[PDB]
Amino acid sequence: MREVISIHIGQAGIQVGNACWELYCLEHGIQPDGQMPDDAFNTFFSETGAGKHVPRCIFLDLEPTVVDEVRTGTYRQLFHPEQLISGKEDAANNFARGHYTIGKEIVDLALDRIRKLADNCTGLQGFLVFNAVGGGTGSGLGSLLLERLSVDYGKKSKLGFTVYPSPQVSTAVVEPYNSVLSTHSLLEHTDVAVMLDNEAIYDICRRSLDIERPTYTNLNRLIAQVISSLTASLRFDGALNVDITEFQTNLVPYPRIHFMLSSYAPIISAEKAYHEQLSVAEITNAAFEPASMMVKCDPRHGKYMACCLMYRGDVVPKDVNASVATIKTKRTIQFVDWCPTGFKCGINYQPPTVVPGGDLAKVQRAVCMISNSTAIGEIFSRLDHKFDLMYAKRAFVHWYVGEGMEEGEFSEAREDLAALEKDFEEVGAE
Amino acid sequence: MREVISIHIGQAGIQVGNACWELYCLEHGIQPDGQMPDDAFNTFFSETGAGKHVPRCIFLDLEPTVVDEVRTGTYRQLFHPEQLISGKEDAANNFARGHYTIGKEIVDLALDRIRKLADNCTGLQGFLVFNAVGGGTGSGLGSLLLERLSVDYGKKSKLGFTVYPSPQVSTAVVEPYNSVLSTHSLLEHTDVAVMLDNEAIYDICRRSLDIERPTYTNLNRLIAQVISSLTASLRFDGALNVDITEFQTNLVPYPRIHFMLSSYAPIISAEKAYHEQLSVAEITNAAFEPASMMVKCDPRHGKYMACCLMYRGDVVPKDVNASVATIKTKRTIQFVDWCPTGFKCGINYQPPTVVPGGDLAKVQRAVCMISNSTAIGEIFSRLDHKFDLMYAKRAFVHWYVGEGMEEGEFSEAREDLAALEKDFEEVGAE
Amino acid sequence: DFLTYQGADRDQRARQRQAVAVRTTARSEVEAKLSGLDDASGLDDGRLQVA
Amino acid sequence: MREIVHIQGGQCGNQIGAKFWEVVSDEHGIDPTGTYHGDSDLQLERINVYFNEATGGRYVPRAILMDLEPGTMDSVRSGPYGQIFRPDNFVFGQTGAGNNWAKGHYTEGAELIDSVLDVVRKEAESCDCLQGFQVCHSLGGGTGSGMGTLLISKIREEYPDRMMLTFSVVPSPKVSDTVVEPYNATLSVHQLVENADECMVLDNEALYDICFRTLKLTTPTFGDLNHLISAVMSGITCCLRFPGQLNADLRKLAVNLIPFPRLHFFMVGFTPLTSRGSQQYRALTVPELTQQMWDAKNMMCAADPRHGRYLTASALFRGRMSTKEVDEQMLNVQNKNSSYFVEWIPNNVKSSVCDIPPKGLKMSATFIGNSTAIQEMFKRVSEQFTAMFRRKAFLHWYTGEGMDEMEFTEAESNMNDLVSEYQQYQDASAE
Amino acid sequence: MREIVHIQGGQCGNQIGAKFWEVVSDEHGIDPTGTYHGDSDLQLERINVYFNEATGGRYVPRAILMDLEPGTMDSVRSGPYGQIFRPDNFVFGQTGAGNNWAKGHYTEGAELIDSVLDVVRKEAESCDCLQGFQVCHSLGGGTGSGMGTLLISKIREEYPDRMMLTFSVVPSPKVSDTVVEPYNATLSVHQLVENADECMVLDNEALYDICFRTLKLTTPTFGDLNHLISAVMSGITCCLRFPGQLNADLRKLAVNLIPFPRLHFFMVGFTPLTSRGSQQYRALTVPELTQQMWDAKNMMCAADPRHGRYLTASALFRGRMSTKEVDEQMLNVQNKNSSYFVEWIPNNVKSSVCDIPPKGLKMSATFIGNSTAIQEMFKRVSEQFTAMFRRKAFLHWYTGEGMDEMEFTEAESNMNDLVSEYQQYQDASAE
Amino acid sequence: VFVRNDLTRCGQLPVRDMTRCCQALVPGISERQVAAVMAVVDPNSAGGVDY
Amino acid sequence: GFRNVEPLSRQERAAARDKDLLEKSRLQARNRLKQPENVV
Ligand SMILES: Nc1nc2c(ncn2[C@@H]2O[C@H](COP(=O)(O)OP(=O)(O)OP(=O)(O)O)[C@@H](O)[C@H]2O)c(=O)[nH]1
Ligand SMILES: Nc1nc2c(ncn2[C@@H]2O[C@H](COP(=O)(O)OP(=O)(O)OP(=O)(O)O)[C@@H](O)[C@H]2O)c(=O)[nH]1
Ligand SMILES: Nc1nc2c(ncn2[C@@H]2O[C@H](COP(=O)(O)OP(=O)(O)O)[C@@H](O)[C@H]2O)c(=O)[nH]1
Ligand SMILES: Nc1nc2c(ncn2[C@@H]2O[C@H](COP(=O)(O)OP(=O)(O)O)[C@@H](O)[C@H]2O)c(=O)[nH]1
Structure with missing residues (x-):
């Protein structure tokens, strides 16, 4: 009745999907074999007559290795083999390769399976697209898939949990190129886009979890906890229920402005746990701390427009009200003049489940703050010069041209990102 | 003493007859073997010297499967083996097949057994013909049998509880064709024809009984309850008795206009039962609700000409008078200007018996509302364009021609249905 | 037996309602415990004893 | 034999209604299975x-x-x-x-509204005589506010003469739950002014204040607030359900409370609300009940009556009591606080007495105050609505449901005119 | 008691018939020795x-x-x-x-056809009532196509009224087995148009595609394709053999499917075809079976229904199911894909329900679609036949059997006329 | 963490102490796994393996 | 081991025989103020 279709595109999408689905299995009691020893799972799993539960997810990638890792690992009897879709040739960090030449047949099969999945859902809250902006598979194929979904499904709410390149640290070289292309693509298709940065999550792990060597598994576990907190109100009852449709209404002031900073709290290891009180006010403050942001974007530079807080566990409305009143009275936290309330508080009675093998402690309270703020334009500003610096020499441009793109596409993407910068400046200004 | 001869033609006829005879056996206490552990069964069963009771019914079909199912089921020792009549070749949704070539010997044998049945009846209130408008067997053979009965028996009241095609949902393709043909046939032979729609009864089952997956068994149970409520005055005593001759004389303003909408109340499951008062006024209002009609035809569109109410159980004439007066004062329900009374109320002291294994609850009160209203012209209007849309291309016309039909027959049927539309418009107009 | 699907739907509805009833009873007990705290409960009884 | 049709709308309205029906069944000795177990005629x-x-x-x-x-x-x-x-x-x-008033009033509320009216009409015709309808819901929510206003308009169209009572949970002043609360409240108040005969304004922050200061609870969940709301909802109609020394029905309360048709918004309070610690310290007397009744802290509205002027006030007492005591108390209240009461009305109190107090309490009393203080609450809601509407933030979500931008400004104009009327009768001078 | 005479022709037809009889005996609980061992009445x-x-x-x-x-x-x-x-x-x-159609129809088929008709008459006269004949064979093969067409003509002459159902393995589009497949297919289609009352078209490459994409088999031999075909042959007539909630015989299917006599070519498909890995993963609902039904990949003919327009479509469901659910699913399919359905037929779906599903499967469903998509298959066969006939390649083999060249032209003209009728009813507009 | 749980600064911890440390690091670890690692680290010891 | 079934009273048979008495009894069973048509 509250089904949500999960899409995981590219290596990063699949690797965060592994953590997400392990977390969902742990939360709902579903064993990795597929079945558990009501109907709260229906959002993420569809049950069969035999009692065995299959997730409503689709693992899309043009490379076979990542998907075969899932096919060989513990969750081989859980997922649908055809829902795991594997390509033959990788996109090789080429947006054109993933969007024009290789991605065609793969996206056709993906839409086929997505139709089959949506046909099994009475209701459909929306799509959760988890991809990696900065890679040919994630950016190009993901952009094509989002465009097709917008064309055919229509008004279904697509929430894109995208991972943009970090300000200074990165793993690719053409990452500004394909990131600009995919941002051009997804400015007009996704309904609410959640920004994530590897550098910011690395900093969170290093400072809060005391992990001197954070890794992709830790990053994915944090992202999985955040998405679980986001979807908790769909699956578990509690005071002040918040919905996928209500995210857009209480978070998106205008259709272009729908990019969101995400921050989880508390992030504490068990050795540091039960060593602080972890009250509602303190976890709210931690969630509003700039270091707790999962994007290398200081909110002090900009102004908050909206903030949806998702409380999990033993949280009382009096405490959320007191904490939010303190936040409003706080001076460093600054809101736009045209949004006096700017807050969407929603509580859930289900505490965040702890993944065995993870670093997170078993905490009875949690906050997931997803905020629309004009500061997010800074990351686009960074990519806008990282792009044009290479584009001046047309470096690596032959690679993108070879798979059927044009200089006009790069020009249009750069112009649209400049327009997005201007829109962020205009919404920030009085 | 007050016998009524039951005829069930076609698959729908036999399938509703199964439910009808289950209901009659339960109501009179007759075990399925044939005998029971005063003279209230004479309307439906004739008792033998051995004490075993045989029903005065005739199961007519050109297909052996449906009849052999009854021959094999629990009611194999109840019905007369020769009364169960089976053909060799099915009519294949062909009115010409069921009316010109296959149906001849079958209808001859049907008249033979019907004469044998009528010779065993001192009185004879009339015939209850249950067939399927929209199939070769029910339409063609049923029309032929009705014509033969009109020729030989004459003035005996034939009450046809016909099942018409639903507006949008349907199971056959040549259903408009054979429906128009059968309507042409029965406009001039049956005395009172009650329309029934599978879509309407499905909606009733979904909304009232909360059955998300209604089936033909549920439909036939509802129809059987309606027929038992109609016939209750023949078997059980009560104030304001109604007779088969009286339905006509109180319901048929003109010979051409004798088609009737049917509605039952209450339709409530056991779980929903004993949560509402179920008073006479409330159940009468339910019966006059457009949703409770067993035909997909909103009665607001037309004007009621006559309404016969058949009450079962703890109903008092003061209560029925108050309820019907409120109905008259109601603005939504509107009657023709030339019929100030327009109401035929009849009460019976026998509450409706509940079939074990069914979804209907044990209610102390019941209402069967059978209404002659000009709104019924809407369904004929739908079939009249469904017919001519196919007839313009002469689709499936060769199939009907092959078994001894002519284009003149289709033309005559279409013209007669147009004339019926015109008559309904004329009587509705002042 | 012929109508398994209808019985299956009835059982599904009954199970869902029973599970939600169990959840509501547990939450009602927890809320009663939370709302029981008031002035009468000896929250400062130890402080009074110490003083 | 004067029936009331109760309607619950939205999550908050449904929770309030469930608590209210639990309280009423407790009052009438009805177990959750429906059987009577009260042992009282x-x-x-x-x-x-x-x-x-x-x-x-x-x-x-x-x-x-x-x-x-x-x-x-x-x-x-x-x-x-x-x-x-x-x-x-x-x-x-x-x-x-x-949280979209447009979704709950035009797009999605429209299809369900005919089922709702079918149920409402079925329940209404079963009534021998109908006092009216009471609708409990929350302003500032999508389905609650939207479908509640739509249903109220439809019921007003069908039964104009029948009483309409509303228990609306106005969005709280200080701490707001959702962003679009000013929009939903602005669109709902415009409907309530035109349609609802009697409207009772509740604020969750006033409820938190009263349960923190009078009840002195530490962890007030929504259940406690719904319990107080249920207490008022019962106490307003207990004069219908129980014999009274000076009984007064809903229509009598409306006639004595509403001076002019548009000035039908009321703040309510219930007495005696006592903390479990101070229950033995407090003495149950009519003067004590009146003292807690006229305390601004007792009002379940955020607006305080001190800022405004009491146009009218009804006090429905419950318990075996002295009519002389009650009348003298209300007269002394008026004489002491004549500055807070409107001059051009000789008596600003409708005193009613019922002989059956609520279970556990020897005495009780509900207060229904029509005062110009509600002006500041509407003014605050408008101060938020105008700020949001100037830049048209989140306006596209309401526009995509197909409602005119002019509708927002029309609702704002209706609110401003209502505020103007309240100020007019706040500063109206006799002769 | 409505009998069906099965005929197998050629190598492919005989293999398909053997597999079909194995499947039918399995369903009826008949061991290879003929004794009944089903333990079911x-x-x-x-x-x-x-x-x-x-x-x-x-x-x-x-x-x-x-x-x-x-x-x-x-x-x-x-x-x-x-x-x-x-x-x-x-x-x-x-x-x-x-692989000589002329040899199988004129020279060598003539002598054996007397014995064939003798056996057919002997089998038919023993039957109490005869529904008709079902002939399984492959177009594009000498003995199969030729002898099948000749026998179909003879049986049409002998029993005009009785049903003729044909399962013809039309030569595959992409990869052809024998060279003279276009000649044999062109000559056989001309006969089937005139004689065969009802015809299903099967393609080996379509069967390979469905077994590679749905069943995901690795080494599918001809046995697997014959087993899919046999499942279709059983499911089309299971309503005759088992009690059904809404039963439908072959004549009913033909009446509800064939609008005009020449448009009796159909594409068929079977559900649910599930790969081993996804068997526990798939949940069997009537919507699921319908969704797999209406997919183009499920069709056993090469032509995809998307290009054409569904003139008619019958669906025979098997198992314990809701007639409301089935009818609602088909109405929803028609409403959603109204672009693919003919306008001048208000209802393009003939739904039949049988109460006995196949062994092991909880419920199943077979599909028979009359759509103008088959026009492209006939067009491709024409594109090959005309290409070879222009240079008269391999024509001397047919000529040396006593076959006129004018017969080839007549067959091509007839097949092109059939294509023209399909296109006319694809682009026909109502009124 | 092991240093914090080692009060004596002896470099050695008991089974309970190192299971507590390993649970503070990763909650899902049971005592048997920690003891097995203890044994494979120091084969012949009466507990108190060097952390 | 003899099977037994409850014997009905003469009053029940008289009520079934009489239209008036049966209807009056049903009215009395209908509801609790003054019984509807209480007086037989
Ligand atoms: N946060 C996070 N980011 C990841 C993770 N794995 C990969 N990424 C990011 O994903 C980007 C590339 O992902 P993909 O496009 O899917 O890589 P791929 O599957 O080989 O596809 P292509 O590189 O486009 O050919 C890199 O720039 C990484 O920054 C992960 O586990 N967590
Ligand atoms: N309401 C209702 N309608 C039914 C039921 N069974 C069949 N029908 C209707 O009956 C119609 C077909 O009836 P028949 O003509 O007798 O089918 P048949 O027995 O195979 O005979 P032919 O179709 O003439 O070959 C269908 O269109 C159904 O709508 C039933 O149980 N209840
Ligand atoms: N007193 C009370 N208020 C509530 C309750 N639940 C929600 N609210 C408040 O009611 C306001 C409106 O929410 P609501 O109308 O229920 O949401 P909707 O159902 O989607 O329209 C919210 O801002 C909440 O603060 C409750 O149980 N009791
Ligand atoms: N599905 C299926 N197709 C077959 C089989 N055997 C042959 N075919 C195909 O049928 C086509 C015609 O061969 P066929 O008519 O049987 O040869 P003939 O018996 O000499 O006339 C060939 O192109 C084969 O690909 C089989 O067992 N199953």
Whole structure:
């Protein structure tokens, strides 16, 4: 009745999907074999007559290795083999390769399976697209898939949990190129886009979890906890229920402005746990701390427009009200003049489940703050010069041209990102 | 003493007859073997010297499967083996097949057994013909049998509880064709024809009984309850008795206009039962609700000409008078200007018996509302364009021609249905 | 037996309602415990004893 | 024999209604299975105001729950008194309104509204005589506010003469739950002014204040606030359900409270609210009840009566009491606080007495104050609505449901005119 | 008691018939020795449709096996269910047709056709009532296509009224087996248009595509394709053999499917076809089975229905199911894909329900679609036939058998006229 | 963490102390796994393996 | 081991025989103020 279709595109999408689905299995009691020893799972799993539960997810990638890792690992009897879709040739960090030449047949099969999945859902809250902006598979194929979904499904709410390149640290070289292309693509298709940065999550792990060597598994576990907190109100009852449709209404002031900073709290290891009180006010403050942001974007530079807080566990409305009143009275936290309330508080009675093998402690309270703020334009500003610096020499441009793109596409993407910068400046200004 | 001869033609006829005879056996206490552990069964069963009771019914079909199912089921020792009549070749949704070539010997044998049945009846209130408008067997053979009965028996009241095609949902393709043909046939032979729609009864089952997956068994149970409520005055005593001759004389303003909408109340499951008062006024209002009609035809569109109410159980004439007066004062329900009374109320002291294994609850009160209203012209209007849309291309016309039909027959049927539309418009107009 | 699907739907509805009833009873007990705290409960009884 | 049709709208409205029906069944000695277990004749004497007798001994509430999402109704049905309600009176959709008054009033509320009116008419015709309808819901939510206003308009169209009572939970001043609360409240107040005959304004922050200061509870969940609301909702109509030394029905309260048709918004309070610690310290007397009644802290509205002027005030007392005591107390209150009472009305108090107090309390009293203080609450809501509407933030979500931008400004104009009327009668001078 | 005479023709037809009889015996609980071992009354209730009782409990299939070479029926006899068939029903020549339609229709088919009709008449006269004949064979092969068309003509002459159902394996689009497939197909289609009352088209490449994409088999031999075909052959007539909630015989299917006599070519598909890995993962609902039904990949013909327009479509469901659910699913399919459905037929779906699903499967469904998509298949066969006929390649082999060149032109003209009728009804507009 | 749980600064911890440390690091670890690692680290010891 | 079934009274048979008495009894069973048509 509250089904949500999960899409995981590219290596990063699949690797965060592994953590997400392990977390969902742990939360709902579903064993990795597929079945558990009501109907709260229906959002993420569809049950069969035999009692065995299959997730409503689709693992899309043009490379076979990542998907075969899932096919060989513990969750081989859980997922649908055809829902795991594997390509033959990788996109090789080429947006054109993933969007024009290789991605065609793969996206056709993906839409086929997505139709089959949506046909099994009475209701459909929306799509959760988890991809990696900065890679040919994630950016190009993901952009094509989002465009097709917008064309055919229509008004279904697509929430894109995208991972943009970090300000200074990165793993690719053409990452500004394909990131600009995919941002051009997804400015007009996704309904609410959640920004994530590897550098910011690395900093969170290093400072809060005391992990001197954070890794992709830790990053994915944090992202999985955040998405679980986001979807908790769909699956578990509690005071002040918040919905996928209500995210857009209480978070998106205008259709272009729908990019969101995400921050989880508390992030504490068990050795540091039960060593602080972890009250509602303190976890709210931690969630509003700039270091707790999962994007290398200081909110002090900009102004908050909206903030949806998702409380999990033993949280009382009096405490959320007191904490939010303190936040409003706080001076460093600054809101736009045209949004006096700017807050969407929603509580859930289900505490965040702890993944065995993870670093997170078993905490009875949690906050997931997803905020629309004009500061997010800074990351686009960074990519806008990282792009044009290479584009001046047309470096690596032959690679993108070879798979059927044009200089006009790069020009249009750069112009649209400049327009997005201007829109962020205009919404920030009085 | 007050016998009524039951005829069930076609698959729908036999399938509703199964439910009808289950209901009659339960109501009179007759075990399925044939005998029971005063003279209230004479309307439906004739008792033998051995004490075993045989029903005065005739199961007519050109297909052996449906009849052999009854021959094999629990009611194999109840019905007369020769009364169960089976053909060799099915009519294949062909009115010409069921009316010109296959149906001849079958209808001859049907008249033979019907004469044998009528010779065993001192009185004879009339015939209850249950067939399927929209199939070769029910339409063609049923029309032929009705014509033969009109020729030989004459003035005996034939009450046809016909099942018409639903507006949008349907199971056959040549259903408009054979429906128009059968309507042409029965406009001039049956005395009172009650329309029934599978879509309407499905909606009733979904909304009232909360059955998300209604089936033909549920439909036939509802129809059987309606027929038992109609016939209750023949078997059980009560104030304001109604007779088969009286339905006509109180319901048929003109010979051409004798088609009737049917509605039952209450339709409530056991779980929903004993949560509402179920008073006479409330159940009468339910019966006059457009949703409770067993035909997909909103009665607001037309004007009621006559309404016969058949009450079962703890109903008092003061209560029925108050309820019907409120109905008259109601603005939504509107009657023709030339019929100030327009109401035929009849009460019976026998509450409706509940079939074990069914979804209907044990209610102390019941209402069967059978209404002659000009709104019924809407369904004929739908079939009249469904017919001519196919007839313009002469689709499936060769199939009907092959078994001894002519284009003149289709033309005559279409013209007669147009004339019926015109008559309904004329009587509705002042 | 012929109508398994209808019985299956009835059982599904009954199970869902029973599970939600169990959840509501547990939450009602927890809320009663939370709302029981008031002035009468000896929250400062130890402080009074110490003083 | 004067029946009341109760309607619950939205999550907050459904929770409030469930608590209210639990309280009323407790008052009338009805167990969650519907059977009477009260052992008191007066409990069954006027049970038909709220309940109907089923085929057996069961009594079913004349309550209708409407919602666009089934979760809140599932919780209500699974609650302790969830089984008394008739299952057919749960009218729910499938896609909830995302805090969108437009979604709950035009797009998604339209399809469910005919089912809702079918249920309402079925319940209303069963009534021998109908006092009216009471609708409990929250301003500042999608399905609640939207479908509540739509249903109220429809019921006003069908039964103009019948009483309409509303228990609206106005969005709180300081701490707001959702962003679009000013929009939803602005669109809902415009409907309530035109349609609802009698409107009672509740604020969750006033409820938190009263339960923190008078009840002195530490962890007030929504259940406690709904309990106080249920207490007021019962106490307003206890004069219908129980014999009274000086009885007064809903229409009498409306006539004595409403000077002019548009000035029908009221702040309410219940007495005696005592902390469990101070229960033995307090003495139950009519003067004590009046003292707590006229305390601004007792008002379940955020606006305080001190800022405004009391146009009128009804006080419905419950318990075996002295009419001389009650009348003298209300006269002394008026004389002492004549500055806060309107001059051009000789008596600003409608005093009513009922002989049956609520269970556990020897005495009780509900207060219904029509004062110009509600002006500041509407003014604050408008101060938020104008700030949001100047830049048209989140306006596209309402526009995509197909409602004119002019409708927002029309609702704002109606609110401003209502505020103007309240100020006019606040500073009106006699002669 | 409505019997069906099964006929197998050529190597492919004989293999398909053997597999079909194995499947039918499995459904009826018949072991290869002919004894009933099903332990179910309904299996024996209508066993007379396909089998006759022997001296003891043995049941003999009503099948007639045709060939010009004895090897194929030697294989049939050596197969697991090779001993059920009566030895008198094996009719063979000595020299097989070298993929020569002229040899199988005129020279070598003429002598054996007398014995073939004798066996057919002997089998038919024993039948109490005869629904008709079903002939399984492959277009594009000498003995199969030629002898099948000749026998169909003879049986049409003998029994004009009785049903003729044909399962023809039309030569595949992409990869062709033999060179003269276009000649044999062109000559056989001209005969089938005139004689065959009802025809299903099967393509080996379509079967390969469905077994590679849905079943995900790795090494699918001809046995798997024959088993899919056999499932379709059983499911089309299971309504005759088992009680059904809404039963439908072959004549009913033909009446509801065929708008005009020449447009009797159909594409068929079977559900649910599930790969081993996804068997526990798939949930069997009527919407699921319909969704797999209406997919183009499920069709066993090469032509995809998306290009054409569905003139008609029958769906025979099997199992414990809701007629409301089935009808709602089909109405929803028609409403959603109204672009693919003919406008001048208000209802393009003939739904039939049988109460007995196949063994092991909880419920199943077979589909028979009459759509103008088959026009492209006939067009491709025309594009090959005309290309070869312009240079008269391999025409001397047909000419040396006593076949006129004018017959080729007549067959091409007839097949092009059929294509024209399909296009006309694809682009026909109402009113 | 092991240093914090080692009060004596002896470099050695008991089974309970190192299981507590390993649970503070990763909650899902049971005592048997920690003891097995203890044994494979120091084969012949009466507990108190060097952390 | 003899099977037994409850014997009905003469009053029940008289009520079934009489239209008036049966209807009056049903009215009395209908509801609790003054009984509807209480007086037989
Ligand atoms: N946060 C996070 N980011 C990841 C993770 N794995 C990969 N990424 C990011 O994903 C980007 C590339 O992902 P993909 O496009 O899917 O890589 P791929 O599957 O080989 O596809 P292509 O590189 O486009 O050919 C890199 O720039 C990484 O920054 C992960 O586990 N967590
Ligand atoms: N309401 C209702 N309608 C039914 C039922 N069974 C069949 N029908 C209707 O009956 C119609 C077909 O009836 P028949 O003509 O007798 O089918 P048949 O027995 O195979 O005979 P032919 O179709 O003439 O060959 C269908 O269109 C159904 O709508 C039933 O149980 N209830
Ligand atoms: N007193 C009370 N207020 C509530 C309750 N639940 C929600 N509210 C408040 O009511 C306001 C409106 O929410 P609501 O109308 O229920 O949401 P909707 O159902 O989607 O329209 C919210 O801002 C909440 O603060 C409750 O149980 N009791
Ligand atoms: N599905 C299926 N197709 C076959 C089989 N055997 C042959 N075919 C195909 O049928 C086509 C015609 O061969 P066929 O008519 O049987 O040869 P003939 O018997 O000498 O006339 C060939 O192109 C084969 O690909 C089989 O067992 N199953």
